[PDB]
């Protein structure tokens, strides 16, 4: 037990890896198998899964992973060295993608679980893309291999074909996102690992070759494995591995030596327990007692596979050989994550992962105890050692080297290492580990950087947790008894801490809206709020999605606004942005941190813009990565440039505020290009102050946006459904009812199930999963993820339309409804006032 703590001293014998994959791909089962291997006293029941690493009531009852769970455990290697592994058991549901990222940011490596029968599916593609964004090491585990044997009964040649197709698809997808070709994946390379987590099968080519060696002896398992995949064949006449089949009907080496023994060992346990099982069991050296042979097929198969494949050394050596240790893998983590960069002295100190260096931890997880009134931080120690009962200085998401307000001095009490449900308390934690921290819940909100006080005062924070999806679902939440409103308010804070991507916002009318990614996400959020945090009755409004605001035509005339001093006059125009350019800003293709030459070169070359106009670009939209552009257009022949630069910043904040809250839908102006066509700046500094210019900038932005014919963008979800062939026609009709257009319908290779990918409006996507599941009797299952904002049918500025209450209006009316009711939800006016 003490060796578990002592192993944290060595920064190379620790691997920080996150287990990610699609929904129900054996990740939790794999962690359960690892726990059973390392914990003698923990055993799953014969029919019910172990359900270890899932501690929430919702996790067990729903059966879907909710909260990423930390597992620290010591596992022997293939050679026999006990390494230390920290695992993020992450939810596979796309709606909880944020829960992956919080564990993904502090993870050196990624283990991608893919179901053998299912295929890649959607969340796996999104996961590999996003992990490529953090440039993490990538390993692939095709779990549930037994489903190719015990379910589809595919011939071993076809099983190899399916596995090779899946591996090639994963490699192509990675090559489509990652420029570095070093991320190629192959079982011979130690990247691809095969497994069936239900029966405790976990082997790579090296592990199986080592099994062969221990069976016979004097065998180089490494070189044997390096010839155990692909179009290689084996000749028993010469005992030699060739690139061509020695005979005509010969089988490939992978089939001959790996898939074939697995097929037979499964078949002799599923079909011939009483007839032929003892012979093949004595053949392989597996000795089962008379009682052990009396178990049912599944527990007996799990037991025999546990006895045969032994330890899970394939996973261990995969992670050791392909996932860098924190000591060596810290440098890319600092390069991509830290705001100050590796160039600074702190960057150099934290790149070395020095246990004796300056204290620095990065907390990205919050865990609720039984009471729920005191959260526990969870994060990676990137430098130094944190000690129990020690003063620390916690920074915030908005903290900079100037603003010291966001920090706070907190005493850290007892701290522990979380092994799923049970955590081991430790006096201190060296660098590179994953640690639970107590006593820092109050100043920590979502992402947090913790450092030591009275030293390293030039310490910045890590970049805020970036999420793959844009949370568009919005539900208003109110208390049943307003006399108990504060409690619910308190509960809100708790959920805002617990769920990384949860956004709780109080609107003007007093409605506390909550932003969620999908139906299940908000369902679990409100279950936690009612049953665990608030413990009081709550009320939900009808779900509704957010809306963005855009323009489709050039502003008819230049719109002007003036300061209350009547001396600064700003006149602007409104135009839409180019296709993909908004997506380019969204994906950080081009950033405001770029020097003017690079951004100008991008704009003029790729998008055919004028060089002067490209140099005339001032700022981006609602945030630094906002999809709106603010561009100077004052001609130098009439307007001074240096004088304009004094109020350029104030106009920038004004435009950012205007894009944040749109005049039409009260928020989120998207895909709009604004050009300042006239600037009259008062010659004295006191007549051009920010408090004077920023409201004027907001007013002129509103006038320019409203003068041009506006449009409402509703979020379109990209929904792919995996369903049998007979249900495809029904899915077509169900998608047609909810105003969704079908894009693709591809039968899954190596499986009789089609996959239909379509786009459905998010506002019309509520209950779509339940509708499709119940309409096809559970055969068709769907997952929804945000894809792209699209123009809603209708004109938001056509007042001749009358909105019939409690009736689904036709498409030409929708936009009007979609804004008017939205205004009623904000407490705002009935109609947008063009004058204001």
């Amino acid at each position: 037990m003490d060796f578990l703590a002592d192993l944290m001293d060595n920064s190379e014998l620790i691997r920080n890896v996150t287990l990610c994959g699609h929904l129900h791909h054996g990740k939790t089962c794999f962690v359960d198998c690892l726990i059973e291997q390392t914990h003698p006293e923990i055993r799953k029941r014969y029919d019910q899964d172990l359900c270890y690493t899932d501690i929430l009531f919702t996790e067990q009852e729903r059966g879907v992973g909710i909260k990423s769970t930390p597992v620290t455990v010591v596992l022997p290697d293939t050679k026999g060295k006990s390494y230390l592994f920290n695992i993020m058991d992450t939810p596979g549901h796309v709606n909880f993608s944020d829960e992956v990222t919080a564990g993904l940011r502090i993870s050196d490596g990624v283990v991608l679980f893919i179901d053998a029968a299912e295929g890649v599916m959607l969340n796996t593609e999104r996961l590999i893309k996003h992990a490529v964004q953090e440039r993490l090491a990538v390993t692939v585990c095709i779990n549930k291999i037994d489903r190719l044997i015990l379910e589809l009964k595919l011939p071993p040649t076809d099983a190899y074909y399916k596995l090779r197709h899946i591996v090639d698809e994963v490699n192509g997808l990675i090559s489509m996102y990652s420029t570095d070709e070093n991320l190629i994946l192959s079982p011979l390379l130690g990247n691809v690992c095969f497994s069936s987590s239900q029966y405790s099968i976990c082997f790579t080519l090296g592990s199986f070759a080592k099994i062969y060696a221990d069976t016979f002896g004097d065998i180089n398992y490494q070189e044997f494995a390096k010839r155990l995949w692909g179009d290689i064949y084996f000749n028993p006449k010469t005992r030699k591995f060739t690139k061509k089949a020695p005979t005509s009907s010969s089988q490939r080496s992978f089939v001959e030596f790996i898939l074939e023994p697995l097929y037979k060992i499964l078949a002799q346990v599923v079909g011939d327990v009483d007839t032929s099982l003892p012979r093949t069991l004595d053949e392989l050296g597996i000795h089962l007692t008379k009682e052990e042979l009396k178990l049912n097929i599944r527990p007996l198969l799990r037991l025999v596979c546990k006895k045969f494949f032994g330890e899970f050394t394939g996973f261990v050596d995969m992670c050791v050989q392909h996932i860098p240790s924190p000591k060596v893998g810290a440098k890319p983590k600092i390069e991509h994550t830290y705001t100050g960069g590796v160039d600074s002295d702190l960057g150099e100190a934290m790149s070395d992962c020095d246990p004796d260096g300056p204290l620095m931890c990065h907390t990205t997880k919050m865990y609720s105890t039984d009471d729920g009134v005191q959260f526990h931080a969870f994060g990676r120690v990137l430098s130094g050692t944190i000690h129990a009962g020690q003063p620390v200085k916690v920074l915030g998401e908005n903290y900079t080297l100037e603003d010291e307000e966001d920090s706070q001095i907190c005493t850290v009490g007892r701290l522990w290492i979380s092994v799923a449900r049970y955590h081991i308390e430790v006096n201190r934690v060296p660098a590179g580990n994953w640690v639970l921290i107590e006593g820092v819940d109050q100043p920590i909100v979502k992402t947090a950087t913790i450092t030591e006080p009275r030293g390293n005062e030039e310490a910045q924070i890590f970049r805020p947790l970036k999420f793959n999806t844009t949370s568009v679902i919005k539900i208003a939440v109110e208390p049943v008894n307003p006399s108990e409103l504060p409690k619910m308010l308190d509960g809100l804070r708790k959920v805002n801490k617990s769920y990384p991507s949860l956004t709780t916002k109080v609107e003007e009318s007093g409605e506390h809206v909550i932003l969620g990614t999908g139906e299940l996400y908000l369902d679990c959020v409100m279950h936690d709020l009612r049953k665990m945090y608030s413990e009081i009755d709550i009320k939900v409004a009808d779900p509704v999605v957010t809306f963005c605001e855009t323009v489709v035509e050039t502003s008819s005339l230049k719109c002007f606004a003036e300061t209350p001093n009547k001396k600064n006059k700003i006149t602007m125009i409104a135009e839409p942005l180019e296709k993909g350019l908004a997506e380019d800003i969204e994906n950080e293709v081009v950033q405001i941190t770029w020097n003017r030459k690079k951004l100008g070169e991008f704009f003029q070359t790729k998008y055919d813009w004028d060089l002067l106009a490209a140099r005339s670009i001032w700022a981006f939209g609602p945030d630094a990565t906002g999809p709106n552009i603010l561009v100077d257009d004052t001609l130098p022949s009439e307007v001074d440039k240096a004088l304009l630069g004094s109020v350029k910043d104030s106009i920038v904040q004004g435009f950012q505020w205007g894009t944040r809250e749109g005049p039409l839908c009260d928020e989120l102006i998207r895909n709009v290009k604004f050009k300042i066509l006239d600037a009259v700046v008062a010659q004295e500094p006191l007549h051009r102050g920010g408090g004077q210019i920023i409201p004027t900038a907001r007013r002129v932005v509103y006038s320019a946006f409203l003068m041009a014919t506006p449009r409402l963008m509703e979020p379109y979800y990209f929904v792919e459904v995996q369903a049998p062939a007979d249900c495809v026609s029904a899915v077509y009709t169900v998608l047609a009812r909810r105003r969704g257009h079908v894009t693709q319908d591809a039968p899954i290779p190596g499986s009789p199930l089609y996959t239909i990918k379509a786009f459905i409006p998010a506002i019309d996507s509520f209950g779509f999963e339940t509708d499709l599941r119940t309409h096809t009797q559970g055969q068709a299952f769907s997952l929804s993820v945000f894809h792209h904002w699209q123009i809603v049918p209708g004109d938001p500025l056509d007042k001749s339309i009358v909105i019939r209450p409690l009736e689904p209006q036709p498409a030409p009316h929708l936009a009007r409804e979609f804004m008017i009711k939205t205004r009623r939800r904000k407490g705002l006016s009935e109609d947008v006032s063009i004058s204001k």
Partner: protein, 49 residues
Amino acid sequence: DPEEDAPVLDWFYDHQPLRDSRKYVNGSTYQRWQFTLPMMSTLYRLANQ
């Protein structure tokens, strides 16, 4: 069917099918039955209805 239902035809319609068969049932108390895959598959094929 003499060919499909080979293992169960002997004892299919007895009052207690295998009561004195010590291999399959512990004893006369007729508890804790132990079967084999062929007879279970035969029973399933018969009971598909």
